[PDB]
Each structure stands twice: as C-alpha cells, then as structure tokens.
Design a protein around this ligand. Structure first.
Ligand SMILES: O=P(O)(O)OC[C@H]1O[C@@H]2OP(=O)(O)O[C@@H]2[C@@H]1O
Ligand SMILES: [Zn+2]
Ligand SMILES: [Zn+2]
Ligand SMILES: [Zn+2]
Ligand SMILES: [Zn+2]
Lengths: 276, 193, 145, 353, 353, 144, 279
C-alpha cells in the first residue's frame, strides 16, 4: 500500500466495476464487456486497459510478471513492474513458471501457461471491425446477428492484394465457437497458443473501455478458409544468443547504420535455453 | 578640445524638447532655446540644442560642408554618439545653412507611405527669422492664419510652397537663427503672399 | 603577464564563488591601497545565441552583469565583469586583476591564489560530472511493436 | 444629495495591505526564503528567468516570492525590472558545443559521440505523489561513476556531415531586437526566436501540440536535448579581448521535424531550435516546435492551423501583454458602458416599448 | 509511435535520484515544506488546484513541491492522484449569491449596491521588485472597518431586472462529465466550461487576448468579479437532508459582452462565465472570454478567430495531453528515425544522382 | 423539526477546525463506547456549479471529502462529511453527531460544544470581514 | 524627489526616442508612429503608453492632472498620479484650467483646454480599423493608401442592422482631412471637443507600441453619413448633484430595488457647477 494511495492505485469503485465486467465477460467468452470507469492519466501508453485489469485482479500474494513484446527488460515493462511493486508490494519474477499474474503487451509467453495463472493483454482496440464499420451502432448488433462474414473480407482480399495472408498481428479469432474476438497485436505464432489454454486469459482495452476474457479450456480457432487454412510460417533463422529457432524471434538494433540481430522475444525462454 | 553640452542635460533637454514641440505643433511660432549658451560654431544655439536633445546612436546626422567642421563632429559623436554620415540620403537629422542646394534637398529621406516617420528632419540655419519674403501659413497648428518672413533659400521656399512630396511624405523643416527656432512640418500650407 | 594569462586569471576569478574568493583573499592578508576608478555597477548583458548553435545570431534574453574597475597607486588599471549583482565581488575581482598585472603580486597570487581557486572549481566540476555520469545510459531498441 | 468623496487611495492601500498579508500567509510558519525557492522551486525559477528576460536565479526567485507564486506576475515583475537596468555590454554568441553537460539525450541516434546522459529528469517517473514529502526528509545519497566527460559534438553536426541536414551557418547578419523596436511582421527568424523565448510556455506548448494535427502519426524527433552550463564572455572596450564573465545553466533543444525537398536542392531534414534558461526542457521543445512551424514562409509552405500563423502566434505569445490586457477589464469602464447602455436603451425603446 | 527500449534501469534510477537531489537542492537550506508553499505561494496553488481538478490546498502544494515548482508537472501529479480517490458524493449546485466575499468589483458602473470591494489584489501596485523580501520582515497590520457585508446582488441581476440582459435560467439539463466520457465536438456549454476550467491558464489567456485584439471580438465588460468562500452541500443517502461539508474559496467572473438583436426579443447583452478555485482571477476572466467566444454556435455567429474554434481551443487546452505528447518525442525512436533516414536517402538519390 | 438542528450542528462540526474541535472535545472529557461501522474514508466530492451563477449546472472540478460513521452502544448512528483529508476530524465529527442525538448530550453539548464553536467561527469571520471592508472604495455619502 | 530612479523613471535614451516619436506624430497628424515602448511598473493595458508619453514630456514646472473616467479619484488615476509624484515630484491638480499636462483615460475634460495645455490619451487599440481588420500587416497598408472605405462600410452595416451607428465610444475621427484616427475610448459625446482645440493632443498606446497626436487647431470630424449625422450621448436627467445638463453623466445604482442617480463623470466640472450655485 503506497502512502496516500489505495491498494493497486485504483479506487475501490473502479475496481468493483471492472471486476463485475470481468465476471460478465467470463460468463460471455469473447464478448467485449463495456465498463464505465473514469479517465485516468498515465505516463506510459501501455496501461489504459491492462494496468486497470491488473489493479482490479492483483492481490498481495500474487507474483507479477510484466512483459513487453515478450521481454521483461523493456523500459515500459520495468516501469509497470516497479509501479505495481510500489502500489501493491507484490513479488515479481522473471519466469513464466513461477508467476501467478502475467501482464503482457502483444505477446503470449513461450512457456505453457499452467493452472492458477491469469494472463492480461493490453488491447489498443477491442473490436477488429473498427477498420471497416465507422458507426458502432451496427457493430454491437451484428455480434448478435452473428454477421462475422464482413471481417472475412480482409482475409479474402489479403491474398489478392499481396499473394499471402500478411495479417500476422491482431489476427481475428472465433472463441467458444460463437464470439469473434481480436486479441492484442500478438503474432500469428502465438494465436495457436490460445486454443484451450489451461490459464484464464483477460483482455482489456482502455481507450475504448471494453473487457473480454477467455475462460480456461475455451475453444478459440483462427478465422480463415478451408482452401486457405490458418498456418504459421516456420522460422528458418536461429536466435543469436541461444540458437534455438522454436520460439518467435524479435529484432534488436545494435548500431545507427541499420545493423541488427534476431533474438528470442520471450527473454525468459531465451534464458532457459541459454542456461541449458 | 570638445564643445560642452547642456549644463543640466536632463532638464535642458526637456525644456528644449518642449520649446521644439511648441514650435512644431503650432507652425510659424518662434521659440527661444535659452538652455545652451554657446552653440557649436558654425552651428548656432538652436541647432546645437536640437541635436543634443534629439540626436543619439539611432539617428544618423548629416552636416552640410559649410557646417561640417572637425571639432563639431568630435563633440557631436562624443556627446550624442550619433552616427556621422557623408551623404544627405543616409541622415535622420540633416543640418544645413543658406547654402543648401536643390540636389541635397531632394536627396534627403522623405519617408515612405507606410512609414512616413522614417524620413529626415532638415535643421536649416537662416540669416534671420524675419525680413525675408512674406509667407502666409495655414493648416494644423494655425488657428486661422499666420504670417512669417524668414530668409529662406529659393530651393527650400519652393519645397515649402509647392510640396513636391505628397502627404504623408515630406521633410519637417526647422529654421534656426541664434537662440531662436521656428518649425514648419510637412503638413503646413505655405504661400508666398 | 601575456593576454592569455590575464584572461585565465580573470576567468578563474569570475567563476570563483564570491564567498571562497573573499575568504581566500582575506586569508592572504596581502592588502594594498587602490582607487576605485569605476564603482561596482550592476546592469545587464544582452545574451547572443546562435540558431542551431552555429547559425545566425539572435538575442536569448539578458543576464545580470556586475562590472568594476580599480586603479593602483602605480597606475595599474584592473577590471572585472562577473555575472550576478555582487558589487563587492566585482570590485574584488578587479582588485586582484590590478594586483596581478604587476610582478610584485603576479607570481605569488598565481601560485597561491588563482591556482587553488581553479583547482577547487575543477574538483567541483569533477564531482558533479561523476555523479551525473552515474546516470549514463545505453538504450537498445526493438523493431516492430 | 450624495456629495462625492475621496476613497480611492485609501482603497488601494488597504487592498495592497491585504494582498501582502495574504502573501505572508500564516505567521506561525517561517517565511520561505528566496534562496529556498531558487534551490527547490528551480523549475519555476527557470520559467520565470526565461520569460522575464533576465537570467538571474535570485531575481526570479524573488519575483516568485513577491508574486505569491503567480508565475505571470513574477514574469512581469522581472520584465519591468529589466527597464531599470542599463545594457552594459553584449556577449559573444553563445557556444553550446562547449557545454558542461548536466543532461544530454537524443531520440534519433543511439551511439552519439560523448554518450547519452539522462541527467536529472522527471522522465520515466511514476506520477505518484510522494506523501513522504509532507514531512522532513533527505534525498538518497548520489551514486557516482567515472568523473570524466568526453567531447560531445552536436547531433546535427553528424546529420549535416551525412548530407541529411543543412548546417546552420552564420551569415553575419545583425539580429533583430524587439526590446529596442516594436515587432514588424513579417519577422526575421532572429526576431521570431527572441519573441518565442519570451513566450508563455503553456501557449507555446498548446501550439506545438496543435501542430501535431497537421500530419499523421509521424511525429517529430528530439534530435538532441542538451542541458548544461555555457560560459558567458564579453569583449569590453577597456581591454579589447574577450573576458569570461561567468556561466549560465541553459537547455538547448534541436528537433528533427521531417524532411523537405527545396527546388534545385537535395532534400534534407528540417530543424527546429529552442533555447531556454535552466532545465526548462518542455519549454525548449515547445519553442523548437513553434519555431519550426513559424518557419513556414521561408520554406514556401501554407499556414494550416493557427500555430503557423506568424502574426497571431507572435502578437499574443508575450505573457505580459496578454495578462495585462485581460486583467485590465477590472479597470472601471462605466463611461464606455454608459455609452453602450444609452444606445441599447434607445434601441430597446424603438424595437418595442 | 511506440519503440520498445531495453537496458536503462540503472541509468533511469540514477537519473531519478539526481532529479530528487536537485529538487531538494542544497541541504544547507531548510526543506521547503508544503504548508509554507500553500500559505505563501497561494496563487500557484490556486492555478494547480484549478487545472489539476482537486480543490485541496495541501495536495496541490505537495504536487508543486514534488515537481520542483513546475506547474505542468504538479498538475499532472494531482490529476493522476485524482484517480486513486473514490467519488463519495456530488455536491448541491453552488449558490454564489451566498458567497462570503473577500473581493468584489464591477467595471460597468462607477458604484453599485455593496460597493467596490477591492480586497486582496496586486492591481494598482507598482511592479517594482521588492528586495527587502531577500530577508525576513513583518507583514503589514490590517486596518479594520465595519465588520459587516452589505447585500451584494450580482450585477447581472441588476442588468436583467432592467431588461438589458437575460437571466441564466436552469433548464434541468444533466451536466456533461468529461472526467467520465471523453468530449465529442461540438460539446454542450457545460462540457465547454468544464474543459475551460481545466485548461492551461497561459493558453486561454492568449486566446482571450486574441479575442480582445480583434480575433473574434465579443466586446467584453467585466460585469462582475467575485472572490470568496462558498458553502458546499451534499445530500447523503444515509441521511435524507442536505448537510454542509465545508467551504471553498472560489472566484467567479461574469462578463458583459456585446448586445445582439434577436428577431422577436428586445436587444440585450450577452455574457460569458468563469469560475475557478482560489483567488487567481485572470484565469476566470479568460475562462469567461473564451466561453463567450465558444458560444458562437449558440448565437449563430460564424467564427473568424482561432478562439472561436471549438476543436482548436478545447483539443489543446489540456496540459496533460500536450505535455505527454511533447515527452513522447524525447523517447528513444532509434528505429523510427532509421526508417526516415532510408526514406530520405531514396528521395536524395532519385532527385540527385 | 430535529432535522434543522441536526443540520446546524453537523455544519458547525464540519466547518470547525480539527485543532479547535479536538481540543474542545478533549476538554469536555466526554466519551461513550462507539464502534466505527464505516472507517474514515477520504475520497472526492464533485463540485457542481451554475452557468451565470443561476443557470444550467456544469461540473467545476472535485474537492477532497472525508466521511466516517460511528454506532453508539444504544444503536444511534452518527455520520460526518468534512472537506479535506483529516480522518480523525471526520471520526470526531461522526462521534459528536451520534452523541447529539442522545437526550443526555443534546442540550449539554449544544451549550458547551456546538454553540462555542459557532461563536468562534463567527468571531473570526467578522474580523476577516472588517479587514476586507477596510478595502472598500467609497464614492458618495448622504449629507443632511 | 526620485528615490533612486531617473527623473520620470525613464532613462534618457527611452525619453529621447519617445520625443522623436512625438515630433514625428505631430508632423504627421493622425498617423500612428511606432516606438520602442518599454515595460512599465503598470501592467500593459493599464496606461503604460500614456505614462511613457507624460514621462517624456513632463517637466519640473508642470502641473499634472490624471483623470480616469473623468475623475481624479479613480484607483488607476490615483496610482498613476502617485507614481509620477514619486518619480518626478511635480505639482498635481484636479482643476483642468489650472493643469499644464492632463493625462486622461476615456474622457475629455468638460472645461475647455487652453493654449499651452497638453492632453495625453491612454489608447488600448491605436488602430481604428483593428476590429474590422485584426492584422496590422493589412491596416498599415490601408493607412498608407488611405483605403478607409471599410470603416464607412462598417458604419453602413451598423445602420442597416440597427438603424443607428453602433459605435458609441472610441468613435473614429478624420484628422486634418487626411487620417482616419482612433480617438481614446472616450464617449462620442467628447468627439466635438477635439475639433480645432487650442491644446496639443497626444495618444499613447503603450502595449501596442504606437504614438499619434493631433496638433492645436486641427480639423477633427467624426465619421457619419449625410442622412445619419453624428449625434452625442444625451440623458433625460440632469446631474443629481449639480443639476448640470451639458456634462457626460454616469449611472450609480443605489439599491437593489432599481433606483438610479446620474452624476457627472467629470467630477472637477461637477464641483465647479456645485460651488457656483447650481445648474
Ligand atoms: O497599452 P497601454 O498600457 O497604453 O493601455 C492603454 C489602455 O489600454 C487599456 O484599455 P483602456 O483604454 O480601457 O484603458 C487601459 C488603458 O488605459
Ligand atoms: Zn534465444
Ligand atoms: Zn477597456
Ligand atoms: Zn513515437
Ligand atoms: Zn454634476
């Protein structure tokens, strides 16, 4: 408890409202449950929806793991981890194995998520079809109408415009076989990991104030065509540190002339492999 | 050696400016500048007072060759720090005597239609402020009419009576004779009677 | 006393904190008689800055400048211009400049007055620079988002 | 029959007495010193020094104390004090390359010569009120590292030697001085910069933020932020050579504001410049952005938004003028309002009855 | 946009330690307390309270102390701290007729029922720096008069009872709350006033100054300025009756603006409105002027000045948004600039071989 | 008609000073076993203002508001709402609110606690009004 | 008599520049002469231009009269007069006929001014076309070319909308038959007093950095149409104090009921009428 502040930095009213919204979202997998909180200014862009969920669901006994693009060394991830250490005092770990709360931005950890874990995803936009439908009045109703063919248009025309499905980030999915949800801009590599995961996944968008959750062991399938099944391009380049190419690789720039290298995005799995 | 300046520069400059303002706002009125007791010869008392109370670094001064003495230049750039130019067109305060020529008069700066105050002021030293051609003055500063007979050069008389430079362009003339000073702004209508 | 040496000791005096200069000068106890040609005057100095640091000049405001000038019995004129408004400091700097213009005090003050002050300033600079370097950073960026 | 009486001077004297009583506040507390404001309210002092026009920390702190913390009032106090003092000299153009860096960062290059240096900053901090500051305390002992500073040439020097930018070369032109003559629009870049350095930081920050709307998500980059001590020296006529009169803590921002393709010239990155007293980083960046926006006429651009309108921006940038002419409505205006009342009464009596 | 950056934890912590040690300043001087700041720098606290949005003197003074006197950073701190508090109630609408006046003036008449009560004000002071404040002293003794407040009816009540102006009637419309839902333009007048009260003082001052100089003139008259304590009341659910929870020191500005000629109503004056915490009144006057300027759609008058532009005025008045925008540009964008370098270089090759 | 009196003494408590109220309550040496059913909580109160002072409502920021509740042994509930963040002050105000509803303390505390506090506040308000009215500008005066 | 500051608080360079500006203004009657105005102890928009003009002009032998809204008892007038007393130590009078330098805000004295008197006006907006054209870059050219037709169009539009000219104070005038000049924010009631006045009129816009003047016996003609002549403010009531009927009156609301009293703005003239029997 930070002096002068509530536990987890949020007033209990916002916590209670977000908790009620989380319960409704769990009872309705894939549905972007609205919640009517206030406006909270934060320095780092990440947090308008993820920090709120973490504060709503974090407890004194939790172990927090903050991840930015899979990494824990990121400046924003370190800042958020320190912020939650200050306002909650929870323990923090660098291992997906020992973590009980994993706040991540645009990345699922390589390590399988076990039971008694919650993973929170920051969602810049909670409705994928905002790029097509400008007015939200039809967007809400078409979910009940099940008119999910409109979002299939971009998938259909991606191959026409480029020859292959290039939507490797924020690829839409259908969860529970009913609700079309768009996760955070996680890579196509991690989209399979959402299929019947042992852990409870929470998605929170702040600038839109919509929450949706994926209960553990919930069937979520990538949206594609039978003639063009959802496939993830295998990686043919290794990691410059541990070498293993079984994990999604991000790029780190080393110089001002464009020089760079590929390293495992999930630094925890990278360290696990390196120490092997 | 350098010519001295106002004994009380602040008070003397204030009084000189008030006399000059009286002369300027009411054209044709002769006023006496009794604050400086010895002008910088060839410059008389009134011309020296005007220069000391108005000239400074910002205002280039052009002295006509008859008045362009050495000690006067030294004292002028020491007491006022005013730039000393060699051509009439570069001057803010032109100083001349009866020997003024038409070319010099027309070279001076009359200002611009958008910045009419960016012109020059001609500080003319005349033989006398009376006894010349009888001149009738009408305009701002003159209730009904005024009569003055300064001994003006023919070129300056033509300038005043004809005004080749339309308003707001024109040179404000300051006639000086010893300690006495008369002013004709560019807005004064002058006829030779 | 070449121009460079006078510039050096004048800069050292100007950058010296008024308190340290006063204390060290009083400890020196080498006091002479001098006539203040120009009473310590505080005015403004117009700051000229450059566009981009190297381009055309503009006026970046003003700073206070306290100037003083001193004369010695033997006719050596000393001067000082120092940012601030401490008139006593300005006249003291002018005094030391006048004293160091003459061989009587030049070598002594250069060896025991100017050098200690410059060394103190260098020590303060070094300590501050070390604690600032404690915050030296090397950021590594990542492509995409 | 309501004989008029005098109560004006005795009104204003009592009002000023009440204002000074309010300034002193509760007497059970020690009266805060000018030195405390200078040392601890150092960013307010930096703003007052920058906008008031006198780089004198003690004077700015005194103005803040006398203004009851009102930054605009302190700025105007310092600006009015400027008239009291005489211009003793004009320094040589400042050399920001010789700065003793308290802080030096760049958002464009990682490996800048001299190294990145975060220095003292509020960046990356959590905006959590430190309630332990409600009571006495002391800051943590400062960590220490190597005590040497490497040479730190400007980032835009690198950009210019790479052909991506144009080096700002002095042509010997005499800078304009708005303090000597009134502004005459259109203004030279020197006049615009001088006015901007005196401009209210909130207004300039809002203008810089509004310039964002002009383009999309490709925001400018802080090519180099550099805060540290610059030596001030003058060439007095009594000596003829340069004398090092002191040093000033200043912040210099050079913003990379995107590239343009001038005709008959290779495209290059346009740059904005901001120079402030003290560590007024936000003000320096806003000044750089507004300077780049006001560079429209010389780049052959069209003003799309008020921020690029030279006259509107500069005429109202000065804090003292805006504050004075808005507060002057508190002056009596019953003569003017009576003239309005008479006309409205006549209009009402004719529109209806 | 968002460049992920790694490897600065040690440097960031060192920078924060440096910033806190500089905020504390020289430890020889005492530590500038928060009670001292709120009592003696009261106008800075007024501005920070008004813009941040919490009318707590001590919290605003603490935020100012933490920010080393910076008003924008203090506003950020207070605005963020507002998030950790629970909304316990909504007060009854303020009744400024019951204000306990510390100051009250009217520029539209020579004298009015109640009198021209100057109160504490820097107006009519000669802004000559007071160097005695460089040391301690004693506040002046306050001359006393009749310890009574005469009926001070609002001047606009007087103008409306003459038919020269219209009473502001309550239609019962529910006020908009930007602190719950982001504004959508065009926004109702209540939303506009709420945003104006939170806007940067130095930017709304400049907009009001622009309107005065002729960029969207509204012919303003300071119809009334009031500063005093207003009782705040709530109606708790536990109870059923209104309870009084305390009093707030606030300033109210009612501007008399140019008259109009409605098609089927007698000509009358228009009016702006401003309302701020504390006794910082220029903010209230600027708020009233910009309120009248933004009332253009209400009166059907096409905008001719930037101050009449609703989106321009309101989208950039927030200090927090503009400060965050400017701070982002400082963050390492090494990758993004490398993209720009390649884009620029291709243009250089295509247009110059 | 006890609502008006309860409002009066609640306002006298809230408008009081924590130092004054605490000192007077300690001097009274009056205390009854009570339990804090609601712990003193400091949050926000939204400020509601009127356009032109009399027109439509708009929101004019927030203030800090502290509230506490106390239940006495007999079950009387005392509440408090005071601007600021002084939680002990709010608890004391709630305790006095509860006590003033007991017939044993109503008249006694009104004579010894509420009326003196109101008198002190009125005295300082009158003094401040005198100091402020010293700044009045006089133009015309009746003459006989 | 100065307490540290130079006489009149301004250095000699500033006053010399202002004096050159005044001379140019007198030589070009009605034209706005720019000058390098300095920041004064009074905030911009509170009379800094008039203060600087008086400081440049005033001398030790002058009797300064400072009136705002026609009265010497106004708070701003009190402050300006006290400042000038501190920095000059000159004689100060409330009688217009006894004054040598008169600094006014929004009022021309009811008493006619004599030959040697200088009246200095405080001007917020030196440009008469500022409200029609906010930009100085355009009004400077409009004055250069004498393109004043837009002011006539403004008067025409006022007539069309209301049937009366809307401008009531700061009523634009034509000076010396050439320059459309903005007077002070004086009532149009005072406009006729500027025509062929025997006193020198100075106009200081300190915040706007402009000085202009009207020489003695200079034609001043308020703008108007032939069928809509120039008319001045008139009240159905005399003064409630001196019974005057030719002085600019002002309202003083007495009580909340709505009882009014009209009394002279020019308090010196009011006192003259009251002591000399009654009107
Ligand atoms: O800019 P400055 O300092 O010369 O102020 C001149 C005039 O501008 C304001 O407007 P106002 O006429 O109502 O009275 C004030 C003041 O007298
Ligand atoms: Zn790896
Ligand atoms: Zn006005
Ligand atoms: Zn970015
Ligand atoms: Zn009368």
């Amino acid at each position: 408890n930070l002096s002068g502040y509530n536990f987890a930095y949020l007033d209990e009213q916002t916590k209670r409202m977000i908790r009620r919204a989380i319960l409704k979202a769990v009872a309705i997998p894939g549905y972007q449950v609205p919640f009517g909180g206030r406006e909270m200014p934060m320095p780092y862009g990440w947090g308008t929806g993820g920090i709120q969920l973490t504060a709503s669901v974090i407890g004194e006994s939790d172990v927090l793991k903050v991840i930015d693009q899979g990494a824990d060394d990121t400046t924003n991830a370190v800042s958020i981890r320190n912020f939650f250490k200050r306002v909650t005092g929870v323990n923090t770990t660098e291992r997906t194995d020992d973590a009980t709360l994993i706040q991540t931005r645009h990345r699922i950890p390589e390590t399988p998520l076990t039971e008694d874990q919650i993973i929170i995803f920051q969602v810049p936009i909670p409705e994928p079809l905002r790029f097509i439908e400008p007015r939200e009045t039809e967007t809400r109703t078409m979910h009940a109408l099940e008119e999910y063919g409109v979002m299939q248009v971009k998938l259909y025309e991606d191959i026409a415009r480029f020859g292959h499905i290039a939507t490797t980030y924020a690829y839409p999915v259908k969860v529970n076989g009913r609700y079309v949800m768009d996760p955070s801009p996680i890579p196509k590599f991690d989209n399979p990991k959402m299929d019947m995961m042992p852990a409870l996944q929470l998605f929170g968008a702040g600038r839109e104030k919509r929450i949706y959750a994926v209960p553990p062991f919930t069937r979520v399938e990538s949206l594609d065509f039978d003639d063009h099944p959802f496939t993830v391009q295998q990686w043919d380049e290794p990691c410059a540190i541990c070498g293993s190419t079984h994990s999604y690789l991000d790029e780190v720039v080393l110089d001002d002339a464009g020089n760079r290298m590929f390293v495992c995005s999930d630094t925890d799995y990278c360290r696990q492999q390196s120490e092997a | 050696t350098l010519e001295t300046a106002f004994m009380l520069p602040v008070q003397d400059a204030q009084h000189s400016f008030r006399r000059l303002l009286k002369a300027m706002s009411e054209p044709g009125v002769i006023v006496a500048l009794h604050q400086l007791k010895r002008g910088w010869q060839p410059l008389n008392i009134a011309t020296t007072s005007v220069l000391l109370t108005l000239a400074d670094n910002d205002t280039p001064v052009w002295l006509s060759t008859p008045l362009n003495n050495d000690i006067v230049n030294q004292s002028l750039r020491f007491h006022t720090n005013a730039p000393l130019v060699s051509q009439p067109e570069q001057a803010t305060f032109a100083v001349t005597d009866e020997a003024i020529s038409s070319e010099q008069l027309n070279a001076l700066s009359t200002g611009t239609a958008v910045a009419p105050e960016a012109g020059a002021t001609l500080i003319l030293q005349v033989a006398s402020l009376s006894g010349g051609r009888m001149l009738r003055l009408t305009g701002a500063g003159i209730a009904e009419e005024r009569m003055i007979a300064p001994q003006l050069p023919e070129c300056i008389l033509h300038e005043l009576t004809e005004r080749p430079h339309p308003f707001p362009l024109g040179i404000d003339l300051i006639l000086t004779c010893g300690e006495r000073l008369l002013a004709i702004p560019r807005t004064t209508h002058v006829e030779v009677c | 006393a070449d121009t460079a040496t006078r510039q050096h000791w004048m800069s050292v005096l100007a950058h010296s904190q008024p308190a340290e200069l006063a204390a060290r000068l009083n400890a020196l106890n080498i006091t002479a008689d001098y006539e203040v040609i120009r009473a310590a005057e505080t005015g403004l100095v117009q700051i000229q800055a450059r566009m981009g640091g190297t381009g055309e000049r503009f006026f970046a405001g003003d700073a206070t400048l306290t100037r003083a000038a001193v004369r010695l019995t033997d006719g050596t004129l000393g001067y000082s211009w120092v940012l601030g408004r401490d008139k006593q400091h300005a006249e003291r700097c002018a005094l030391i400049d006048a004293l160091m213009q003459q061989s009587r005090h030049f070598q002594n003050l250069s060896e025991t007055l100017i050098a200690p002050l410059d060394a103190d300033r260098m020590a303060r600079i070094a300590a501050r620079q070390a604690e600032v370097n404690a915050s030296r950073v090397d950021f590594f960026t990542m492509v995409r988002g | 029959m309501y004989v008029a009486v005098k109560g004006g001077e005795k009104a204003i004297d009592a009002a000023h007495a009440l204002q000074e009583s309010r300034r002193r506040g509760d007497t059970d507390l020690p009266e805060l010193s000018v030195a405390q404001i200078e040392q601890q309210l150092n960013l307010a002092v930096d703003r007052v020094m920058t906008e008031g026009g006198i780089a004198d920390r003690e004077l700015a702190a005194l103005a803040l104390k006398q203004a009851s913390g009102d930054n605009v009032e302190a700025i105007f106090l310092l600006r009015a004090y400027r008239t009291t003092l005489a211009k003793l000299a004009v320094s040589e153009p400042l050399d920001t390359t010789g700065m003793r860096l308290e802080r030096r960062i760049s958002a464009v290059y990682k490996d800048i010569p001299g190294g990145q240096l975060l220095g003292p900053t509020y960046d990356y901090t959590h905006r959590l009120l430190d309630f332990t500051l409600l009571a006495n305390g002391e800051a943590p002992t400062l960590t220490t590292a190597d005590s040497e500073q490497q040479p730190s040439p400007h980032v835009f020097s690198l950009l210019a030697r790479q052909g991506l930018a144009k080096f700002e070369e002095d042509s010997g032109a005499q800078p304009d001085d708005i303090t000597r003559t009134p502004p005459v629009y259109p203004c030279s870049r020197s006049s615009r910069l001088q006015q901007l350095m005196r401009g209210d930081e909130g207004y300039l920050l809002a203008l810089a933020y509004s310039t964002q709307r002009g383009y999309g998500r490709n925001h400018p980059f802080a090519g180099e932020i550099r805060s540290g001590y610059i030596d001030v020296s003058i060439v007095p006529e009594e000596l003829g050579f340069a004398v090092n009169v002191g040093e000033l803590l200043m912040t210099e921002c050079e913003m990379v504001n995107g590239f343009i393709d001038p005709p008959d010239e290779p495209p290059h990155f346009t740059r904005g410049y901001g120079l402030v007293f003290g560590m007024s980083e936000r003000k320096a960046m806003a000044m750089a952005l507004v300077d780049r926006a006001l560079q429209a006429p010389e780049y052959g651009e069209h003003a799309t938004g008020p921020a690029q309108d030279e006259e509107f921006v500069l005429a109202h940038a000065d804090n003292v003028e805006a504050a004075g002419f808005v507060s002057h409505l508190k002056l009596p205006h019953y003569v003017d309002f009576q003239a309005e009342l008479e006309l409205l009464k006549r209009l009402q009596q004719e529109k209806n009855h």
